[PDB]
Amino acid sequence: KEHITPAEQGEFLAAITASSAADVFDMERLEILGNSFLKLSATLYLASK
């Protein structure tokens, strides 16, 4: 837990903003890691259940 870091507000702003809105920052890089996490969690949940 010592390496825990605050969930930065700018990070959520990047998550909420899509690529359509031509902003300097977007969601894809966070989206990839989120996709991997979702797949992992789905697999583990289903197997355990």
Partner: protein, 352 residues
């Protein structure tokens, strides 16, 4: 179970948008405390001859704020991209607590808030109306001026003077004789437009060249030509002639038309070539507003700041909501003492 819907893969849907809870019903009211958040724009580009005006003006202490009934949460520093370079924007975490005790004062505040959009930024549409319902996305923008001590107060005089931008109009010679002679002090740091030309777009006067005067030769490419005769050759049929041929001169710089400063204005500008067409304009022939230049500049970007602030508030609401859900809010990092970090440019993206 149904197999039908695995045919249409690219459907879309329509959605009812909502404002951040802070922006909802944020209209100030008479006899009630209202909060103002000063906006500070910190340029990052180095000072040079070409960008001198923007750097010097944007750092002036004559800023504006946003007026609300609700207290805003701390907001991260924000990057913006003008033509002169990158811009850093921050919102004062300390609100300026004021209360309005006269209905007409509120009316003037709202009227100026309407005026800036309607004329200065030209965001108006024929069917727009001033909102007084105090409902979703109802907040005001007010300029600020230094008051007693370091405390800042509302620019009442600027607002009551500029309820609506005056219409730029010319004057024939016959009405120009008895018109009062212009004073350099009346122009310095002000906003001026040239009514003789078809250029109806506002533009800023940087400094006045007292030593300069009409009839003087061009410093470049026109050492046989003077301001007087050249202005004649250009628009004599439109001006008629020039009075006060000996009086001071003014140096001006145009204002960018862009309102979206999110994406870097990447491109080749040829700073020397664009600056080659140095422009010096006759004080009399150019309509002179009383508006201060620096505030106009700081209001140019206002739409972008307001938009980003919108989604920043949304993101903050989500941040607090999640941190509460995971019971991680009580942590000192996420506690009331949260310090949002500056937004980071995602340079890896193609348009950075």
């Amino acid at each position: 179970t149904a197999t039908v819907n695995k045919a249409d893969k690219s459907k879309d849907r329509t959605y009812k948008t909502e404002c951040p809870l802070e922006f909802y019903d944020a209209l100030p009211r008479v006899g009630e405390i209202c909060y103002a958040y000063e906006i500070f724009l910190e340029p990052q580009f180095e000072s040079c001859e070409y960008t001198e005006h923007m750097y010097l003006n944007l750092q002036t202490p004559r800023n504006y704020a946003i007026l609300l009934r609700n207290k805003l949460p701390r907001l991260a520093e924000m990057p913006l991209f003008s033509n002169q370079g990158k811009l850093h924007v921050r919102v004062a975490n300390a609100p300026l607590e004021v209360i309005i005790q006269n209905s007409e004062q509120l009316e003037l505040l709202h009227q100026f808030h309407g005026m800036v959009f309607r004329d200065i930024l030209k965001i108006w549409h024929p069917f727009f109306v001033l909102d007084r319902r105090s409902k979703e996305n109802s907040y005001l923008v007010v300029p600020l001026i230094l008051g007693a001590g370091e405390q800042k107060c509302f620019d009442w005089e600027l607002m009551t003077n500029f309820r609506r931008l005056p219409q730029s109009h010319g004057s024939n010679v016959q009405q120009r004789e008895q018109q009062p002679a212009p004073r350099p002090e009346d122009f310095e740091g002000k906003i001026v437009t040239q009514w003789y030309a078809n250029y109806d777009k506002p533009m800023l006067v940087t400094k006045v060249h007292r030593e300069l005067t009409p009839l003087s030769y061009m410093e470049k490419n026109q050492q046989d030509k003077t301001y007087y005769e050249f202005t004649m050759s250009k628009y004599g049929n439109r001006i008629g002639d020039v009075v006060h041929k000996d009086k001071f001169m003014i140096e001006v710089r145009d204002l960018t038309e862009q309102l979206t400063f999110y994406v870097h204005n990447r491109g080749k500008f040829n700073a020397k070539s664009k600056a080659k067409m140095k422009v010096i304009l006759i004080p009399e022939l150019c309509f002179n507003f009383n508006f201060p230049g620096d505030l106009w500049l700081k209001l140019i970007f206002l739409p972008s700041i307001l938009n980003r602030m919108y989604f920043l508030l949304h993101a903050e609401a989500l941040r607090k909501r999640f941190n509460t859900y995971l019971n991680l809010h009580l942590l000192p990092f996420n506690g009331t003492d949260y310090m949002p970090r500056p937004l980071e440019i995602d340079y890896s993206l193609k348009r950075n």
